[PDB]
Symmetry: none
């Protein structure tokens, strides 16, 4: 649904009932409100992402108040299985911060991964489906949790060769890649 992402839009990768998709998580204009309507599971996954994103912005740019003050809107497209919903977690943080800083995310980036309150990156599933979806969407850098590593190299070489892959353990690491 985008070629060059505006501020607050991050390509995440989703595991659907038929296969893999590339879904744009969106944030626009303290509160967070969330549409695409998921069940409470998404909602909490979002409030932990929301609180990690707030603290991260306090620590990175003590200066910036946008997250702690604004009335933000989170949109997560419907299509992900229930179980896959929180793996948008690192995509949700990235959008908040991309809004917060009025700064678009790096072009050609996709990520998946659950985030914890302190910011640990948790493994997810649908590695294949998602990695296939980044390829078809023409992404060339992909970011994945560190215990999903095997899962990445278990895929065909056709899928993986060419791909700039990062395996992360903590959010901060994703933050650098998305934001030079």
């Amino acid at each position: 649904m985008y070629d060059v992402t505006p501020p607050g839009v991050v390509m995440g990768l989703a595991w659907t009932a038929m296969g893999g998709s590339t879904l744009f998580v969106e944030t626009s204009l303290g509160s967070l409100e969330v549409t695409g309507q998921l069940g409470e599971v998404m909602k909490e996954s979002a409030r932990i992402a929301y609180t990690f994103a707030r603290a991260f912005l306090m620590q990175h740019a003590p200066a910036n108040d946008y997250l702690v003050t604004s009335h933000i809107h989170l949109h997560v497209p419907e299509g992900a299985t229930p179980k896959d919903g929180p793996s948008a977690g690192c995509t949700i943080v990235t959008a908040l911060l991309s809004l917060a800083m009025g700064r678009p995310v790096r072009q050609n980036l996709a990520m998946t991964g659950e985030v914890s309150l302190t910011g640990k990156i948790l493994p997810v599933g649908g590695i294949k489906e998602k990695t296939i979806a980044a390829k078809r969407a023409g992404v060339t850098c992909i970011v994945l949790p560190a215990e999903n590593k095997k899962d990445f190299y278990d895929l065909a070489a056709f899928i993986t060769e060419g791909l700039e892959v990062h395996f992360v353990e903590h959010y901060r690491e994703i933050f650098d890649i998305a934001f030079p």
Copy 2:
């Protein structure tokens, strides 16, 4: 999740549908600089109340232990109690949550490979819990070297096969202060 836990983060031992699990309680700020607690983990009301019990006690305990530290009274904190324990077992996360708070507030991390279970009263009394075998199993599977239990679960722990119970350093406690002293040994005694 962690091998070394940062501040605000504590290993708690849970009784689940499937068996046991070592779970990480996490705490952090969400606004900078009167305070509040936001709680997540998909909690029913009882559990929400359980977290409030730990918050109130933690605030009371810090006022006395570090009478200069206003961090819990003025701050806006998030608490995540990760999912796992049955409804019945949810209260047992209380000292864990107490410890998590005090760890964030004091900026001191918990002693390594510590895990704990026990319900906390409004005066810091530690009540007996269930799932002790599942919980020690989880500690063992998770590499835990030191388990802190309620003194009233002594008999549940002794009546376990010795190879489960083998290799753990175990402290049985009656009050929270005992559980603070095992977690924060280079904090000041009392």
Copy 3:
């Protein structure tokens, strides 16, 4: 002086002695509970603990009755208790909420004290002499105390103890069976 539904007599430890205090639940004006008779954060949470446990406990024993989950309620807990004795009115509150929900008065001639946990444990409290003496000054010949305060009770002069029917309790359900025979 017959307790109407939602009124329980509680024993309080006050800095100069012992007092008897009527805890009071009424309908006022997803339910809600507003508390008065104001006390610090601890006595407030003790109230919250009791309200949460009494809704669980009523759900468990009376599936059909939605009163505690529907009604907007005022808890009055009279002043006087010290801070240290703050969580001691726990079982008394719970008992008023339940009285009121079953529209069932608490038995006559009864006072209680004790902290309640969410799992329904009754915990020991201080001030057992002063409270026992309060019961006695108020006419009460049947009183409900935590199990771990047994010691405390029998360390009293036989003169105080003599004639008082006493129930030592571990779990709130024991208090229910006593208060609502």
